[PDB]
Amino acid sequence: MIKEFNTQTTLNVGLEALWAAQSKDITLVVPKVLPNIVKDVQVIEGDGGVGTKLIFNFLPGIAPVNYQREVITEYDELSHTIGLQVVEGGYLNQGLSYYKTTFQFSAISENKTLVNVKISYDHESELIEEKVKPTKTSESTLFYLGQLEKFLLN
Numbered sequence: 274m275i276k277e278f279n280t281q282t283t284l285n286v287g288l289e290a291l292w293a294a295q296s297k298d299i300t301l302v303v304p305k306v307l308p309n310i311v312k313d314v315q316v317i318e319g320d321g322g323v324g325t326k327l328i329f330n331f332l333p334g335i336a337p338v339n340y341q342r343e344v345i346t347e348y349d350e351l352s353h354t355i356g357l358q359v360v361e362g363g364y365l366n367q368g369l370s371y372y373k374t375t376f377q378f379s380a381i382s383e384n385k386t387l388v389n390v391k392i393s394y395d396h397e398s399e400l401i402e403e404k405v406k407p408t409k410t411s412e413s414t415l416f417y418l419g420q421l422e423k424f425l426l427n
């Protein structure tokens with residue numbers, strides 16, 4: 274049933290800094306990284322592990338939705354893997370019936386890190402809508418990761 278797309282990016286920042294930003298500090302880092310997109314992010318419930326509930330509030334007028342609620346579905350500190358599944362809003366209002374993003378961080382050297390991006394998705398329509406193809410949604414993820422790199426290196 275579930276379709277999967279993978280890509281990779283390499284960022285010139287170290288593993289621990291990236292992993293902290295993407296996990297325990299996500300709610301304060303994301304608005305600083307994406308100040309023209311994300312107004313704020315809250316932890317609704319949970320400690321950061323599986324089943325933690327997050328809400329991302331967006332600036333209106335950019336996308337067809339002004340929030341997304343996410344739930345953590347994987348949290349592995351040894352492999353530095355975190356998965357976020359959309360619960361409400363987000364791409365569920367744009368043509369998909371299921372969406373999840375999983376990041377896995379691997380050190381290349383002290384200040385260079387490989388980021389694997391896995392996008393899992395489904396849609397009810399016989400043909401997928403263009404704006405929610407993973408080739409397109411991954412572009413936004415890569416935009417974010419590059420902005421995260423820029424934020425951490427400052």
Ligand SMILES: C=C1C[C@]23C[C@@]1(O)CC[C@H]2[C@@]12C=C[C@H](O)[C@@](C)(C(=O)O1)[C@H]2[C@@H]3C(=O)O
Nearest residue numbers: 303307310311329343357374413414416417
């Ligand atoms: C530019 C982006 C990329 C977002 C969607 C957004 O439009 C704004 C917020 C990004 C993001 C930030 C943190 C998480 O990595 C993510 C999966 C999410 O929920 O929100 C990230 C998410 C994504 O990678 O799909």
